[PDB]
Amino acid sequence: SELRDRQAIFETLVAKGRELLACDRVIVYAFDDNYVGTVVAESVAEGWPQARDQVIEDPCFREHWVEAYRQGRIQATTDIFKAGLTECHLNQLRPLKVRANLVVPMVIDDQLFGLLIAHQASEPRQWQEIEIDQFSELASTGSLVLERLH
Numbered sequence: 001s002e003l004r005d006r007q008a009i010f011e012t013l014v015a016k017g018r019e020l021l022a023c024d025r026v027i028v029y030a031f032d033d034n035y036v037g038t039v040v041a042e043s044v045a046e047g048w049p050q051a052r053d054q055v056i057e058d059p060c061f062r063e064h065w066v067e068a069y070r071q072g073r074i075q076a077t078t079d080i081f082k083a084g085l086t087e088c089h090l091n092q093l094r095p096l097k098v099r100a101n102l103v104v105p106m107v108i109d110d111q112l113f114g115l116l117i118a119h120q121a122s123e124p125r126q127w128q129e130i131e132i133d134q135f136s137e138l139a140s141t142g143s144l145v146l147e148r149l150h
């Protein structure tokens, strides 16, 4: 079924993603029609909370960024505590443990399905060009598989 096929692909993407970046967490964050995200798959290193199966409503995507991410926007943040974020934003990440993050889009049938997100949990991390390119290509490849499989 479509549901069973998707999950296996999500698991591949998060496993490969964390291997490529050797970071603390990679997730697939999938949007519903409210642009509320669910963590549908996760690969996480020892000692960190499991973000799997969390529903996280963050209005900034629908209110500002969905079309930009469809067009290939990313977020690369070396230190989330120096990114001028509000407490609301910091509060949603604190249960997970995020000190640096890399967010790339998953676009299927010209719509923003979700985001493929990498975390470093306890130290800043400048994401390098080759890492961003690798991770962006992973998410784009996985998205295109999903787009073509059914």
Ligand SMILES: *[C@H](c1[nH]c(/C=C2\NC(=O)C(CC)=C2C)c(C)c1CCC(=O)O)c1[nH]c(C[C@H]2NC(=O)C(C)=C2[C@@H](*)C)c(C)c1CCC(=O)O
Residues within 6 Å of the ligand: 029, 037, 056, 057, 058, 059, 060, 061, 064, 065, 073, 074, 075, 085, 086, 087, 088, 089, 092, 093, 096, 098, 101, 103, 117
């Ligand atoms: C936009 C915004 N949110 C996120 C969210 C995440 N980062 C992650 O690692 C994860 C998975 C755990 C999530 C989810 C990102 C990356 C961005 C930036 C998008 C960009 O510019 O590309 C954002 N959301 C908030 C939350 C805040 N705003 C509200 O209205 C309410 C309510 C909030 C608390 C829930 C903030 C402050 C931003 C940044 C400013 C903006 O884009 O509006």
Ligand SMILES: [Cl-]
Residues within 6 Å of the ligand: 030, 031, 032, 038
């Ligand atoms: Cl969903």
Ligand SMILES: [Cl-]
Residues within 6 Å of the ligand: 062, 063, 064, 065, 066, 067, 068
């Ligand atoms: Cl938009």
Ligand SMILES: [Cl-]
Residues within 6 Å of the ligand: 067, 068, 071
């Ligand atoms: Cl744009």
Ligand SMILES: [Cl-]
Residues within 6 Å of the ligand: 071, 072
């Ligand atoms: Cl482009």
Ligand SMILES: [Cl-]
Residues within 6 Å of the ligand: 148, 149, 150
């Ligand atoms: Cl088909």
Ligand SMILES: [Mg+2]
Residues within 6 Å of the ligand: 146, 147, 148, 149, 150
């Ligand atoms: Mg199709």
